[PDB]
């Protein structure tokens, strides 16, 4: 049709101009991150401003091509990305109020500090003070003071702002023909017009709930084991049948149970595998780390890094030192990392180069399709690389471990428990938090029980109980960065499931023998081929199809994650055979 042909032409010209402006913005931002200067600040600001204004104009232009008259789905995808009205659908008054609220909540969160009540000029920030307390304190009341002070100082500020934010976001979403803001967020998994691969926004709720039901047994056994350990760590404060008090979970929210490892490690006389000392003994340097990562990716049949990557990357510290993978366009790929010769930075190099490998795979796609299949794909791709790179088999191959090294079962259990505290512990947390936000946006939780329901859900889904009662002046959800800064959260759940799906499939392609957690995909070009068949897609195809390309199934599945942890599950069942498994929601520290 004429309109579709004109849409294709518009998108082609958009692609050329966007490539140019995006490259300049990416290069300016890279320069600032590599060399902090007022001049590079200015150059970054100029590039970003040109890019954003260009996108504003192109959004208006994209409106001239109604999707109702487009029959090509790829064209439809590109047009929809540019046509999103978003906050612009509101009146300037409501738009302005929403932006003021958003910036205010962000500022409240990032300036949050709590001070010693007996000496008010002694104050602590979230990072490092309060985080240090929540990770390392064994003082029930100090931890309670930090947890409660954070919620009281910050969440109470946020409460009225969050109420108005719900109102305005719901108006924005309904004006874009969604049910509410939560439905609007779940649109990020939607698929239409592809027979056999469709995915509705309501289906995400069902699939998250079903997979969570399936992981409930493993989580209950992990929870019971951790509860038994914590009763030893905080005597007289934890009921044998009750939820875990929310302030004893190793960070400010219990998002991860990572920092509980040293309080729960099964076999503390066995250290965990650390090849840092071997790396230093063999005089490794950052370049060596990244060359080994490149070898790993080549071994499955993927390309080695570009000459421009090796020229332009900052793998050494001269700069913002966050590990990051930059896909600037025009064949320009870089990694920014202040690499140290440590096992963690070796694994992180594998992760970031996984990001880069994904980026290279879909570079040939149209501009707007040069992205992950959905919000969870990119980090899952990154994570599986670390999984393979840390296995004892892999470390033996690169000569960082002795050929006769054999991992005993106690070390294996320690490693899987540490993995579960982070990976499994965060799934009930993430599901429950997003479920609360979904229900709030839906209108299913009145304001006057926002907190009452929050904690009811914390007790029921997460097995976690507030150490002190919180009335509706609190906004405990908003005390976490992602809530106050208006980020969807379910990505951390889906990302997790995806990453084990991927791994299992790849490891089956590599004909891996033994427990899944010991698998290494090195030297398996069949595995690299299966992975690449999804990587090259970008987001040109539904995420369901992209997932099927790797793992042979069209939907999220938790069974691979359960398989990965099955040895730990078996061990935990045996450990818990004289303990309660599960929890009563009735007990509280203050009742």
């Amino acid at each position: 049709s004429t309109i579709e042909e004109q849409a294709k032409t518009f998108l082609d010209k958009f692609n050329h101009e966007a490539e140019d402006l995006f490259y300049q913005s990416s290069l300016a931002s890279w320069n600032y991150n590599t060399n902090i200067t007022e001049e590079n600040v200015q150059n970054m600001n100029n590039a970003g401003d040109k890019w954003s204004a260009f996108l504003k104009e192109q959004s208006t232009l994209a409106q001239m091509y109604p999707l109702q008259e487009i029959q090509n789905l790829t064209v439809k995808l590109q047009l929809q990305a540019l046509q999103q009205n978003g906050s612009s659908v509101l009146s300037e008054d409501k738009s302005k109020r929403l932006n003021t609220i958003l910036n205010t909540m962000s500022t409240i969160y990032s300036t949050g500090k709590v001070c010693n009540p007996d000496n008010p000029q002694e104050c602590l920030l979230l990072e490092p003070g309060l985080n240090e307390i929540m990770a390392n304190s064994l003082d029930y009341n100090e931890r309670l003071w930090a947890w409660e002070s954070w919620r009281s100082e910050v969440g109470k500020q946020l409460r009225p702002l969050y109420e108005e934010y719900v109102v305005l976001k719901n108006e924005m979403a309904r004006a874009n023909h969604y049910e509410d803001y939560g439905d609007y967020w779940r649109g990020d998994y939607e698929v239409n017009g592809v027979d056999g691969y469709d995915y509705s926004r309501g289906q995400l709720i069902e699939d998250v709930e079903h997979t969570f039901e399936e992981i409930k047994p493993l989580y209950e056994h992990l929870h019971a084991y951790v509860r038994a350990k914590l009763m030893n760590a905080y005597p007289s404060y934890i009921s044998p049948i009750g939820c875990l008090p929310a302030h004893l979970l190793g960070d400010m929210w219990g998002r991860f149970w990572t920092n509980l490892y040293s309080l729960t490690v099964p076999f503390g006389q066995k250290p965990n595998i650390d090849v840092t000392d071997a790396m230093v003994d063999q005089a490794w340097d950052a370049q060596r780390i990244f060359k080994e990562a490149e070898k790993f990716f080549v071994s499955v049949g993927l390309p080695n890094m570009t000459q421009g990557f090796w020229e332009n990357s900052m793998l050494t510290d001269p700069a913002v030192c966050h590990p990051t993978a930059w896909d600037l366009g025009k064949g320009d790929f870089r990694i920014l990392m202040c690499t140290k010769v440590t096992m963690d930075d070796f694994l992180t190099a594998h992760h970031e180069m996984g990001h880069i490998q994904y980026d290279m795979a879909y570079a040939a796609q149209p501009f707007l399709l040069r992205n992950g299949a959905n919000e969870g794909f990119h980090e899952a791709v990154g994570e599986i690389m670390s999984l393979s790179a840390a296995t004892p088999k892999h470390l033996k191959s690169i000569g960082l471990l002795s050929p006769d090294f054999q991992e005993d079962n106690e070390t294996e259990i320690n490693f899987l428990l540490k993995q579960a505290l982070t990976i499994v512990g965060t799934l009930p947390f993430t599901y429950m938090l997003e479920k609360w936000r979904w229900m709030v946006f839906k209108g299913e939780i009145p304001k006057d029980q926002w907190m009452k329901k929050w904690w009811e859900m914390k007790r029921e889904i997460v097995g976690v109980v507030e150490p002190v009662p919180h009335d509706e002046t609190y906004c405990d959800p908003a005390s976490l960065f992602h809530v106050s800064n208006d980020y969807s959260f379910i990505r951390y759940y889906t990302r997790t499931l995806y990453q084990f799906q991927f791994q299992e499939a790849l490891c089956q392609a590599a004909k891996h023998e033994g427990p899944l957690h010991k698998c290494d995909i090195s030297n398996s070009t069949e595995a690299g081929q299966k992975l690449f068949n999804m990587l090259r897609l970008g987001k040109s195809e539904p995420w369901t199809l992209a997932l099927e390309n790797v793992v042979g199934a069209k939907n999220m599945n938790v069974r691979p994650l359960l398989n990965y942890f099955e040895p730990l599950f078996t061990w935990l069942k045996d450990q818990n055979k004289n303990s309660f498994v599960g929890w009563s929601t009735d007990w509280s520290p203050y009742a």
């Binding site: 913005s25 890019w51 707007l368 992205n371």
Partner: peptide
Amino acid sequence: ARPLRHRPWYVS
């Protein structure tokens, strides 16, 4: 702040 290839297109 750096550019994205999807909305919001310019993150911090």
